[PDB]
Design a protein around this ligand. Structure first.
Ligand SMILES: *[C@@H]1O[C@H](CO)[C@@H](O)[C@H](O)[C@H]1NC(C)=O
Ligand SMILES: *[C@@H]1O[C@H](CO)[C@@H](O)[C@H](O)[C@H]1NC(C)=O
Ligand SMILES: *[C@@H]1O[C@H](CO)[C@@H](O)[C@H](O)[C@H]1NC(C)=O
Ligand SMILES: [Cl-]
Lengths: 537, 537
């Protein structure tokens, strides 16, 4: 009997034994199909499941990446190219990857990765997401999936041939494949933990809401993303306009009254032409094609689900990084924050940035933001004014939404674990002033420091082992803490509805705090909305 | 020859030798007259100098106190009775006290005290101000003066017979007396340091502005008071109305057109009847009869003098206590902050208090205050909501005005030293939650802990020695620091215009910080004014 041949519910498949960078060995199945290719008449539409096949399908090659724009802003800068697709771009992209430890488990916990990329970019095949270290060091099945992104994943016109959320129905279908099949690979299908970062975290949080995903997994890890983030969803009316603008931009009919003509033309366009024409006039952290409230995957806004307690009763682990804003500002204010060492911002530049980064609020709101984000010890300090820019973008679009979601989960009686990630890698290629940006924790979550061909210190390797152990303890039990309390493994306390404790994740630290950033988050969530209402006659 | 008989420019006077509680001896001259009694036709008017006398005037008895209301809200509670007049009340109250060390110096520095009491109360004769410890431990001439308070000191109608600021002209005349005479008591008239607390500090600061006082002293110490405090001055237009309201309240004519009838009737009323009818409907930290801009003592608002650099160029030492607001709230919101142990404030009680304590601002401003003064770690915590009431009253009426004054003095090149006083006496008679209140430092400045019959600990005795040494180093040299830096005497750095360092004064501490409370002071001084402007249609 060939332990690498597996009889899935649609056919037999053959995997392959390979080495993790550490030397430990894992079994691997790459590019398992879970849907019909979403091509031709099927573009923009929800996935159909895969047709049965005869024989043995060799599932040993990393799959196609879904069509998306490629980032060339900084040339071959490694900090940017690590997020670009590393396999051929194709609409034929609906595949899953399974990576199992050796020897093969019987009922192991299953960690299912959903990649981020602001819903317009990303792929499960990235080297930074390599599954071999995590599976082999922690004894879990690691699963990853492709899902459609950008307008191919999220075009919405409010018609059956453009119903929205195709990329989310892709993820749901993959979740169903995992529950139907993962036991054949040594995983317990009742022990699936979803984890994802940024738009992948938003995606995970939406599976905590949807009635269609409710029974498809056990618990969730949400790295720097939450469904109350203002970029996370778009209204149905605005999505419809954005789709029609895309149709115009590529030469298609775009009349609100004859939506059939517009969809049909869009289905005939080259896919690269579509994703390369999506980017109109949008503010920072506004992405053109994102989830909507459609009626079937979600039938109410996330804020209404949270207010009413309509979400899955389970544990969650979630957290933020210290410099969440810079990554997005570096690409948006390219004259102000050049990607050079020693950048600073003058007071007059900061005041101009506040208007550009908050383009929708009135005069009174901007002053409040200025007051809230000024260092009153030294108002004109050019470092303080640069850091203020990161914090106001990072608080509003990231940190404060994670806090909000973790709060509601905790108020409703669920165990919550909250982190603030503060480690900057010794080999970080970005300018020193960028600090700990969006996504930096991913390398450590997937155990990349254990790769002996890379430059990580021994301290960083221990750190990555600590983090993988927290993450996988949580998947295995719902609690990141070990049984025997360690010197290397600090205690990670629950984030209670009233304590709101969080654990700082870093090299030489076990600091537990509150929040984080409760005051700035109250500014955005409580003070500023009532001031906008008061001054909008 | 009798060294206790001194020939002043108006006559001879006889003093008396007494003991310090310190064990050392001092010479003392109490009740030296410096003006004609301001009685009869002279009521409300500026002082005339004292008429010459033959013989030897026995100056050995603490002088009369100026007429003022007596506080009975808490009966014989020691925390309150220590501020009540301890000598008979009379309009015949314009006297000075001099206390010299033994053996008598030749050209000693002179520390001249101006009592506080919100311009309606106070007296130089209080036991808490007793001069003997400071004079004998620090080898300085200690001087104190009476000045008229309440409507008797500060009635203004804009006519020659109610010209305003009589109490400040009293202080000016006393300052003159000191420069004409203090060398006969062993003091250098070119080395007068003014010091005062609360309305006494305001008074000191107004002598730093007035052209009539400019050459009458060398430097200044300002404890918890500044001329930018919103209670420190009243407009000429409002002063006139308040005076006319007082006339009405006591049955006098009060027609805005016939001011002579009103003044002449007021000159006939009993002085106690006058001061007991002053208290109309006023907010917290609003006192009816206070300085005005008259044309002669001051001819522009303090803020206009500060902005234009028209103020005396000299060193200043100044500071705040940590709970500046509670004292006034305890007397204003007597149902909410009962003088009992274990008081707390509910969230709903706090929101009502914000409206009562900031009764002039609109809805938007109140929300900003609420947001600024909420503990966002635990918004509903009833200790936090009680402390917030102290901080919003103390910041707005005290701490932030001291900061502003020290800031402007530093920007103009003068040496400034800033303290935050944080010591609560072990024997404090107020409830524990009141913290370190307005006026608490006065006992330590005057060396009261060195009286062994009071209950002070040994550490508190040391603290008082340290503080008298800082204060008198400052009077002697312009710098509170000693020459040989000690472990008992930390370094007190200058408060520079951009560093804004302060020294925390307390038992087990040498902490240096910035501000204090730069962010909250920016809220009152920069943010809230621009938000009121924006929302005032
Ligand atoms: C798959 O692998 C086997 C060898 O292990 C090979 O003989 C076969 O041709 C491969 N391709 C397909 C399509 O099965
Ligand atoms: C003043 O004191 C002297 C000596 O102590 C005494 O003889 C004299 O009577 C006193 N004068 C008055 C007016 O009491
Ligand atoms: C003074 O502060 C130090 C700092 O921890 C402390 O160890 C010491 O006990 C303190 N002394 C007191 C509070 O009397
Ligand atoms: Cl001047």
């Amino acid at each position: 009997n060939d332990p690498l041949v597996v009889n899935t519910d649609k056919g037999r498949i053959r995997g392959i034994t390979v080495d993790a960078p550490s030397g430990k060995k894992v079994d691997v199945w790459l590019g398992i199909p879970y849907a019909q290719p979403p091509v031709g008449p099927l573009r923009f539409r929800h996935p159909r499941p895969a047709e049965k096949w005869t024989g043995v399908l060799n599932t040993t090659t990393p799959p196609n990446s879904c069509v998306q724009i490629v980032d060339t802003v900084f040339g071959d800068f490694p900090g940017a190219t690590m997020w670009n697709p590393n396999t051929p771009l194709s609409e034929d992209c609906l595949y899953i990857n399974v990576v199992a430890p050796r020897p093969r488990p019987k009922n192991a916990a299953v960690m299912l990765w959903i990649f981020g990329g602001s819903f317009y970019s990303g792929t499960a095949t990235l080297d930074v997401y390599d599954h071999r270290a995590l599976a082999s060091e922690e004894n879990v099945i690691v699963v990853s999936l492709q899902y459609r992104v950008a307008s191919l994943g999220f075009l919405f016109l409010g018609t059956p041939e453009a119903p929205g959320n195709a990329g989310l129905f892709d993820q749901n279908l993959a979740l169903r494949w995992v529950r139907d099949n993962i036991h054949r690979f040594g995983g317990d299908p009742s022990r699936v933990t979803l984890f994802g970062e940024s738009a992948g975290a938003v995606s995970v949080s939406l599976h905590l809401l949807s009635a269609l995903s409710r029974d498809l997994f056990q618990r969730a890890i949400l790295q720097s993303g939450s469904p109350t983030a203002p970029w996370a969803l778009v209204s149905r009316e605005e999505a419809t306009l954005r789709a029609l603008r895309l149709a115009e931009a590529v030469g298609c009919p775009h009349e609100p009254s004859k939506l059939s003509d517009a969809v049909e033309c869009l289905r005939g366009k080259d896919p690269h032409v579509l994703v390369n024409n999506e980017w109109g006039t949008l503010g920072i952290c506004e992405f053109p094609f994102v989830p909507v409230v459609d009626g079937a995957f979600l039938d109410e806004t996330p804020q209404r689900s949270l207010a009413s307690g309509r979400f899955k009763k389970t544990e969650i682990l979630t957290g933020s990084n210290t410099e969440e804003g810079y990554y997005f500002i570096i690409y948006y204010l390219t004259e102000l924050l050049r990607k050079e060492e020693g950048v600073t911002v003058t007071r007059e530049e900061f005041l101009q940035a506040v208007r550009e980064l908050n383009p929708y609020v009135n005069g009174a709101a901007r002053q409040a933001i200025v007051f809230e984000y000024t260092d009153w010890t030294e108002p004109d300090n050019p470092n303080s004014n640069r850091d203020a820019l990161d914090k106001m973008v990072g608080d509003y679009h990231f940190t404060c939404n994670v806090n909000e979601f973790a709060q509601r989960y905790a108020e409703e009686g669920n165990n919550v674990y909250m982190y603030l990630y503060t480690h900057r890698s010794k080999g970080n290629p970005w300018p020193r002033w960028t600090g700990v940006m969006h996504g930096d924790e991913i390398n450590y979550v997937f155990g990349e420091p254990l790769n002996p061909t890379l430059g990580y210190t021994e301290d960083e390797k221990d750190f990555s082992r600590k983090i993988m152990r927290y993450w996988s303890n949580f998947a295995k039990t719902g609690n990141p803490n070990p049984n025997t309390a360690s010197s290397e493994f600090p205690e990670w306390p629950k984030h209670t509805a009233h304590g709101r404790h969080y654990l700082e994740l870093g090299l030489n630290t076990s600091f537990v705090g509150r929040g984080p950033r409760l005051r700035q988050c109250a500014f955005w969530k409580k003070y500023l909305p009532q001031l906008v209402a008061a001054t909008s006659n």
